[PDB]
């Protein structure tokens, strides 16, 4: 095979140039509030976000006004406050500000999540840090804000099989000599339907490429 070395050189050069010309958060996640478009790409934001973009604050717009960038403070979100009655918040543990921003209002954060009053065991990266959806819990309100009594979370333990599948199961049992009259049942105790708005793993999320 005749080697393709120019392809090797091109891939290596492009990798180096992408690693050295990384667009920063201050560039990627800036917004023109008059037209609600991203200057970096020119793509307009979805309609349903417009009002929030003009009313709410990004997470580090709050953190940059605090000592140590607000480590140990509690931060919640407007969407969580509207959607859920139980407390939802992040307890910050690590913050990496974007020094290139003029107001230090862009960057990354990590913390412990409590969703609907259930706290997690480990600290992980926070997603949607650049969203205009963030609010800071006052220190004199935290005791009232974090208060939560875990209600009995008793849901269905099992459900009926679909009609045809139930009939097939019963027919198989009867063919194999079993004469049991117990209904076939699907266990759903191991299926926990997590709410669609629960934070995902920001570590697995991608990043916009520089263009």
């Amino acid at each position: 095979v005749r080697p393709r070395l120019i392809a090797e050189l091109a891939r290596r050069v492009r990798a180096l140039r992408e690693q050295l010309n990384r667009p920063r958060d201050s560039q990627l996640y800036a917004v023109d509030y008059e037209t609600l478009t991203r200057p970096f790409s020119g793509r307009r934001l979805p309609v349903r976000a417009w009002a929030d973009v003009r009313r709410e604050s990004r997470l580090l717009q709050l953190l940059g006004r605090l000592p140590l960038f607000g480590l140990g403070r509690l931060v919640t979100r407007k969407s969580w406050l509207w959607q859920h009655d139980e407390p939802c918040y992040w307890r910050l543990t690590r913050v990496r500000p974007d020094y290139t921003a003029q107001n230090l209002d862009h960057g990354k954060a990590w913390g412990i999540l409590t969703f609907k009053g259930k706290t997690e065991s480990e600290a992980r990266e926070i997603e949607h840090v650049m969203y205009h959806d963030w609010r800071l819990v006052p220190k004199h309100e935290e005791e009232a804000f974090t208060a939560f009594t875990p209600a009995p979370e008793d849901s269905l333990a099992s459900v009926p099989y679909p009609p045809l599948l139930r009939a097939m199961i019963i027919a198989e049992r009867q063919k194999n000599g079993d004469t049991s009259t117990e209904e076939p049942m699907l266990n759903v105790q191991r299926i926990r339907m997590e709410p669609w708005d629960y934070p995902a793993k920001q570590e697995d999320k991608g990043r916009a490429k520089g263009t």
Binding site: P162, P163, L164, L165, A167, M168
Partner: protein
């Protein structure tokens, strides 16, 4: 052939002729063409009523279960078909569309009564 990402899905491949559709239930890579390469044919579906006024659906239930257990996804029309067969629960959209049709026909009957 190697596709970037992708997954197996059980779906309907359209065959037949103009004004006469027919569907082959096939498990295929989601990136493949609709009527192109497939992994296995898992059944068929004739959407036109026959001389007996019936829509004939053939389902290879054993292989359907096998491919679902192998990680294959399902297209929405297949979820509706399997719900109709009783293999799955009725899809929520069938129930919602039935309720919408009920409300629309109730509105029509109310119009008739008003007239």
């Amino acid at each position: 052939k190697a596709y970037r990402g992708g997954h197996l899905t059980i779906r309907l491949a359209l065959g037949g002729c103009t004004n006469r559709p027919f569907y082959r239930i096939v498990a295929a890579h989601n990136k493949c063409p609709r009527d192109g390469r497939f992994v296995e044919q898992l059944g068929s579906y004739d959407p036109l009523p026959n001389s007996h006024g019936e829509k004939l659906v053939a389902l290879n239930l054993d292989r359907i279960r096998h491919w679902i257990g192998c990680g294959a996804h399902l297209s929405k029309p297949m979820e509706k078909l399997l719900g109709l067969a009783g293999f799955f629960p009725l899809h929520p959209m069938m129930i919602t569309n039935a309720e919408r049709l009920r409300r629309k026909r109730a509105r029509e009957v109310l119009l008739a009564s008003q007239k």
